[PDB]
Amino acid sequence: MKTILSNQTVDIPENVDITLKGRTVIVKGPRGTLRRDFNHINVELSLLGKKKKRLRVDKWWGNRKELATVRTICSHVQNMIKGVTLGFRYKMRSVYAHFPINVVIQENGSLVEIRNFLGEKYIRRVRMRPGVACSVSQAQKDELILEGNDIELVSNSAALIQQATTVKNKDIRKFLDGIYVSEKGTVQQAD
Amino acid sequence: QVLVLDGRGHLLGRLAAIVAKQVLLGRKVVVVRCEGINISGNFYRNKLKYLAFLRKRMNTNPSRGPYHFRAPSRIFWRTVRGMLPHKTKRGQAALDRLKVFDGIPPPYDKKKRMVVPAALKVVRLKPTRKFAYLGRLAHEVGWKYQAVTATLEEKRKEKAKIHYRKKKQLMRLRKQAEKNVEKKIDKYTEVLKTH
Amino acid sequence: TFKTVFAEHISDECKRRFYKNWHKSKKKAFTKYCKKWQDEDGKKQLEKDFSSMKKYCQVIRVIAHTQMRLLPLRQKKAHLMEIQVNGGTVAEKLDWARERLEQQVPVNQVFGQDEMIDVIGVTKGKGYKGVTSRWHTKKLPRKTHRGLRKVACIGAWHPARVAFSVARAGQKGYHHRTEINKKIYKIGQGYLIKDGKLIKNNASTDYDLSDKSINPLGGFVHYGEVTNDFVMLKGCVVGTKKRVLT
Amino acid sequence: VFRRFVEVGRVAYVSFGPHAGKLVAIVDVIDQNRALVDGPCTQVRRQAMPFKCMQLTDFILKFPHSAHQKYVRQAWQKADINTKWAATRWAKKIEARERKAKMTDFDRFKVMKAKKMRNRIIKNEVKKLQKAALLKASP
RNA sequence: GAAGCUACCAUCUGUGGGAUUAUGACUGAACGCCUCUAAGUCAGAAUCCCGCCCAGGCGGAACGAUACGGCAGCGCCGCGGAGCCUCGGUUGGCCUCGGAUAGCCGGUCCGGGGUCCGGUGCGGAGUGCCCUUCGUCCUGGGAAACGGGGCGCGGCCGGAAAGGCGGCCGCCCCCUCGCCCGUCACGCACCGCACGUUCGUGGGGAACCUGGCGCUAAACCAUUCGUAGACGACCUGCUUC
RNA sequence: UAGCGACGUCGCUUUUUGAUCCUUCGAUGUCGGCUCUUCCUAUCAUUGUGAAGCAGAAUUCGCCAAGCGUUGGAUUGUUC
RNA sequence: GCUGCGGGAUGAACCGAACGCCGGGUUAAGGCGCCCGAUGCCGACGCUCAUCAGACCCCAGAAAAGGUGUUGGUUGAUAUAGACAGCAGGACGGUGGCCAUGGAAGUCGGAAUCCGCUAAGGAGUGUGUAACAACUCACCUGCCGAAUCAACUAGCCCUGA
Ligand SMILES: [Mg+2]
Ligand SMILES: [Mg+2]
Ligand SMILES: [Mg+2]
Ligand SMILES: [Mg+2]
Ligand SMILES: [Mg+2]
Ligand SMILES: [Mg+2]
Ligand SMILES: [Mg+2]
Ligand SMILES: [Mg+2]
Ligand SMILES: [Mg+2]
Ligand SMILES: [Mg+2]
Ligand SMILES: [Mg+2]
Ligand SMILES: [Mg+2]
Ligand SMILES: [Mg+2]
Ligand SMILES: [Mg+2]
Ligand SMILES: [Mg+2]
Ligand SMILES: [Mg+2]
Ligand SMILES: [Mg+2]
Ligand SMILES: [Mg+2]
Ligand SMILES: [Mg+2]
């Protein structure tokens, strides 16, 4: 119905800094930096506040799907702020059948090698994303921890792991086996 | 004489309409950077329509019949063929006058390239509609020369930067010369008569 | 092709390749080109070509030919081959080629034993043969008037043409064909100089250990008396006897 | 980015239409496409004109919402839009385009001879300055 | 039973990259939550396209030889003179990727950020440049220290995607009018009239007289050949060692 | 409502048959078989998937999908 | 048929319009991105994304049915005597009610259907164990905070194809 401006409001804490050269958002913080492009949306991104860091995501007339799109920018900016302050940690417990799933890492935690794989002899290799570090958890059986900054990269790597571990050509109501994403959270707790 | 047209950011049918109108009058028009001509609609749909165009072929003999070009310059040349009366010796002379090039030749590196405002993507499309690249389509279907053309394009872009820095240095020198004095007697007349 | 730079001393077999009638020709090829080699002022305009060759080219192919005097054939014409050097950078490929101009290339230098190397050539000459011998279609029975070795139906009515996939009377053989993935067994030299007065020592393996040559007892049928390097290939190789293969 | 928006009380140029080359002031927006405009001292009557027909400028006024012609005129003459509008480069550009449209043949002859003399003196000075640049770069 | 043809009746070989469909997903609103979707990403196959493999276009390259004999004939540069045919223009503009919810220019600092201008674009194609110059003579005011043209000379390659004009140094015979304003007098003033002015020493073919520098062959037939052949076509030999 | 689905009802195709006679009566050679090429999908199998009353095996129902296969025979002139 | 011409690309019947040979102007039927004459109007208002878009009487393709895909429209219901969502807590006693019997103890069934505590419990919306049990919902309440929900209807597009 050609609705006049819809604006979303983002508060940015003092621990991080933001810089926009247009629709490109570059957020620098304690756990690295992260930059993204919003070139394909055409929504105004303004900031205000002398060391107060109040971001506004403002869209004029548009349509209903574009008024839906203007909140997506605010949500991904919130996700980038959470990833640059705390980071993303995904915990994956290996729900295993009679055959266990032996998981090792090869190249700095960026190459997850899966063996014994529902009894299949084929050793499987999964190459992760540039910017995500994986590890095998201690004091817990067959837990796989994926730590990183970008939620899209971390969760796409976890999706590649949970789709690499897939029961094929059988019933998947029985044979509940695979490496599923158990817990989603942050690296630094109590925040 | 010659009309050297840029191909970046133009739409296929709009640019083909303007070129096919201006080539029947006699102005020798050359469309350069043909790999950058955009096509509105979804890119999956554009390659589906081009796959259907490939599926169209004569069954009794495929050679004697439809000739399906994969290069984007020849794609635009077939697009202007379908709009000119090419079975007659008016559209045949118009296709002889028309030249098309993927990438940029050296004389068109030398000369200045025009941009048609009525055929532009920004002018003719709402900015939330999907589009396509004819070079992306041509590399995805058939035309195996995207990497060589992109390498030569980056080379001539570096050449264009190293020419533009020299031209901008000369323009700063001539505006220093205009900042200097003993020229204003003609300049008052020029300001009173449209500087 | 950017530019082609030949060598200086070009052999008579290459000159027989460049000419058609060697008898009627006055044998005048490459006189001015050898004059360009001899001239010192022509050398600076020749080494400038290699300095341009290092800068503007990526694929370098080296022309080589064969020595026909070491064969029992009768052709006496060499065969020129562009061979793409797939080495490192253009600079050291050009340095390798200029170092090895006017030189011989054995088979042990590039090829080796137990290597899986494809063969390219031209098939046998069977001539203008018929349909059942070309396309191997089924014969018609005995009761058929107007032929037995024919395709009996070509097309339907509504396509009022002949389809290009219909088996018809094509010429059998003398076609360019490539066969892939053939293993080399033995690359062996033969007929070395007179320290040992004449060594045969071919097809003499670790378990044979006898005096034997390349050729069979009585020479090769329709080829001759092989006295050179030879590649011992697996299976069946496209072509007749006495035929050029790459 | 977005230095100018439409507003109750903003002067705006008109490029297309029978009122071309004239300023108006936007009183209020009707519905998304047309806005009621008014000009007290710019020879244009209070009516509704489209946004793509008009052209936004950078000067603002202080109107009440849907005020009368008297209050529009008083806010106009308090803001002094005419002298301040002549004192910008934009009106100089439009006036120069009008002068180039209103040239005659003798004026074009004078412009061409002054153009030759200026471009010759500029070319000689550019040559002298690049000669001095080479003389500086030679040590 | 030789040679030769032939048999899944003997024997050898048959080869991988991309975007994606179905589908499963990620982040994520609409719709506080959810969601594979509305924008954006991931995996994804006998399907598709290409690689490999075949014949290579009224398609283009690089190189060689480029007509003796006794006269001859043929190339490159610069030529002055004449003639037939064909068709078109009446200045060429020597160039930054990119963006349109963004972008141009200038500039201390370590390609980047801060700062300064301009912006329905004037560092602009509603543009810029030699240009609306018919020429000459005489004499004066501005600007001009590069001169300003080249049969020019020696060097550089810029330019590799289909390249030939442009820039620098040193000389050469001159110009101090290579230009803007003022004075003077002339050139056809062809007496009202069209196709006039242009890149034209326009494109190519056949010849005319002359200077300089060079060139001295190759196909096709005939004969032979068999690795090929219906005929043509294709691969081949020929020397006086 | 995994798979089915009456009583009713809306469609698609010309692989059957029927209806009409529009062309063909100074003739379009009228069944079946053999050989051979090409196309469609409403998929029998294979590749990749979704759902079951899918424990495995074996099946059944759907999607993308026509690239490649889709036999040897006794009977009948047979189509069948 | 006996009849040309301009449009419908092509046409016997469609729409205009009927014909001596020509010059100028105007128009119908139609059309104005290029073929192909003419919108190269600084045309106006909105609708539509379709991985099988759509594009003009006869005329050359399609239905019943469906869509939390958007766009209007109608009829209602809620909400500061703080709703819809979201998260969290409670969800009893009479009574293991009554007809049944292998069990029905809100959950296969037939009938019925009330009261107390209440802030609230329906002789109970579903899942489950064969039952008895556990879970959730109606209903009530804790935090948040002001707009929200339901059923029809017809325009485009999609599935049906
Ligand atoms: Mg099974
Ligand atoms: Mg033979
Ligand atoms: Mg018979
Ligand atoms: Mg999907
Ligand atoms: Mg009839
Ligand atoms: Mg009949
Ligand atoms: Mg007949
Ligand atoms: Mg017939
Ligand atoms: Mg007949
Ligand atoms: Mg098939
Ligand atoms: Mg009548
Ligand atoms: Mg008609
Ligand atoms: Mg029609
Ligand atoms: Mg008329
Ligand atoms: Mg009309
Ligand atoms: Mg027209
Ligand atoms: Mg019909
Ligand atoms: Mg609806
Ligand atoms: Mg439809």
H/E/C letters for each residue in chain A? CCCCCEEEEEECCCCCEEEECCCEEEEECCCCEEEEECCCCCCEEEEECCCCCEEEEEECCCCHHHHHHHHHHHHHHHHHHHHHHCCEEEEEEEECCCCCCEEEECCCCCEEEEECHHHCCCCEEEECCCCEEEEECCCCCCEEEEEECCHHHHHHHHHHHHHHCCCCCCCCCCCCCEECCCEEEECCCCC
CA of B23: nearest nucleotide by C1' is G34
| Solving technique | cryo-EM
Residues D24/D46, Cβ–Cβ less than 8 Å: no
Strand E–CB C32 distance below 7 A: yes
D1 at A interface, C-beta within 8 A: yes
Chains A and D touch (3+ CB pairs under 8 A): yes
Which tokens in the block code for residue D33? 């496409």
Question: Measured between alpha carbons, how far is D124 from B178 in angstroms, rounded to an integer?
Answer: 12
Categorise residue A80: left if φ over 0, alpha if ψ from -120 to 50, beta otherwise. Answer: alpha
Burial B118-153 (b: 16+ CB within 10 A, else e): ebbbeebeeeeeebbbbbbbbbbebbebbeebeeeb
Residue B176: list chain D partners with CB under 8 A.
129
Question: Measured between alpha carbons, how far is B30 from B4 in angstroms, rounded to an integer?
Answer: 5
Query: Is the CB of D114 less than 8 angstroms away from the CB of B186?
Result: yes
> In 3D, which of C148, C127, C128 has the Cα closest to residue C138?
C148
CA of C196 to the centre of ligand 4 (A): 77
C-alpha atoms less than 13 angstroms from C-alpha of A67 in its C-beta half-sphere: 11
Question: Measured between alpha carbons, how far is C209 from B140 in angstroms, rounded to an integer?
Answer: 60
C-alpha atoms less than 13 angstroms from C-alpha of D101 in its C-beta half-sphere: 6
> In 3D, which of B121, B97, B152 has the Cα closest to residue B39?
B121
Question: Measured between alpha carbons, how far is A121 from A104 in angstroms, rounded to an integer?
Answer: 16
B39 to B43, B100, B137, C141, C205: CA distances (angstroms): 8, 17, 10, 60, 68
Residues C226/C215, Cβ–Cβ less than 8 Å: yes
Query: Is the CB of D96 less than 8 angstroms away from the CB of B192?
Result: no
Chains that touch D (3 or more CB pairs under 8 A): A, B
CA distance B81 to chain C (A): 28
Cα D97 → chain centroid: 11
CA of B21 to the centre of ligand 14 (A): 28
Helix (H, G, I), strand (E, B) or coil at D105: helix
Residue A63: list chain B partners with CB under 8 A.
128
Q: What resolution in angstroms, rounded to 1 decimal?
A: 3.6
Chosen for mutation from B43, B122, B128, B131 (greatest number of chain A CBs closer than 10 Å) is: B128
Distance C77 CA to E240 C1' (A): 22
Query: Is the CB of B189 less than 8 angstroms away from the CB of D100?
Result: no
D130 at B interface, C-beta within 8 A: yes
> In 3D, which of B183, B184, B190 has the Cα closest to residue D103?
B190
In the DSSP assignment, the letter for residue C187 is E
Residue A61: list chain D partners with CB under 8 A.
32
CA of C138 to the centre of ligand 8 (A): 27
Residues 32-91 in D having a C-beta less than 7 A from any atom of strand E are 55-56, 58, 88-90
Cα C113 → chain centroid: 20
End-to-end CA distance of chain D: 48
Categorise residue A142: left if φ over 0, alpha if ψ from -120 to 50, beta otherwise. Answer: left
D2 at A interface, C-beta within 8 A: yes
Q: Where are the alpha helices (DSSP H) in chain C?
A: 12-18, 31-38, 40-56, 90-99, 131-134
For residue B71, give every residue at least 6 positions away whose Cβ sits within 8 Å of its Cβ, in sequence order, or none: B102, B138, B142, B143, B145
CA distance A89 to chain B (A): 35
Residues C1/C84, Cβ–Cβ less than 8 Å: no
Distance D109 CA to E180 C1' (A): 13
> In 3D, which of A24, A154, A138 has the Cα closest to residue A87?
A154
Residues C85/C97, Cβ–Cβ less than 8 Å: yes
Residues D83/D46, Cβ–Cβ less than 8 Å: no
Question: Measured between alpha carbons, how far is B138 from B71 in angstroms, rounded to an integer?
Answer: 6
CA distance A12 to chain D (A): 21
In the DSSP assignment, the letter for residue D58 is E
CA of B141 to the centre of ligand 10 (A): 22
> In 3D, which of D8, D12, D63 has the Cα closest to residue D30?
D8
Sequence-ordered strand ranges (E) for B22-108: 28-31, 38-40, 99-100
Residue B187: list chain D partners with CB under 8 A.
114, 118
In the DSSP assignment, the letter for residue C235 is S
Question: Measured between alpha carbons, how far is B186 from B180 in angstroms, rounded to an integer?
Answer: 14
Residues A90/A158, Cβ–Cβ less than 8 Å: yes
Nucleic chain G contacts, Cβ below 7 Å: A 1-2, 63-65; B 13, 16-17, 20-21, 24, 41-42, 44-45, 48, 83-85, 90-91, 126, 129-130; D 15-16, 20, 31-33, 50, 52-53
Residue A46: list chain D partners with CB under 8 A.
1
Helix (H, G, I), strand (E, B) or coil at B110: helix
Chains A and C touch (3+ CB pairs under 8 A): no
As residues whose CB is below 5 A from the ion ligand 2, the structure lists: C 127
The H-or-E segment that residue D109 falls in is helix D105-137
A24 at D interface, C-beta within 8 A: no
CA of C144 to the centre of ligand 3 (A): 6
For residue D114, give every residue at least 6 positions away whose Cβ sits within 8 Å of its Cβ, in sequence order, or none: B186, B187, B189, B190
CA of A1 to the centre of ligand 19 (A): 27
Chains that touch B (3 or more CB pairs under 8 A): A, C, D
How many CB pairs below 8 A link B and C?
11
Chains B and D touch (3+ CB pairs under 8 A): yes
Burial C60-70 (b: 16+ CB within 10 A, else e): beeeeebebee
Do β-strands D10-14 and C230-233 pair in parallel, antiparallel, or remain unpaired?
A: unpaired
CA of D20: nearest nucleotide by C1' is G42
B 93-132 near A (Cβ less than 8 A): 127-128
CA of C158 to the centre of ligand 17 (A): 21
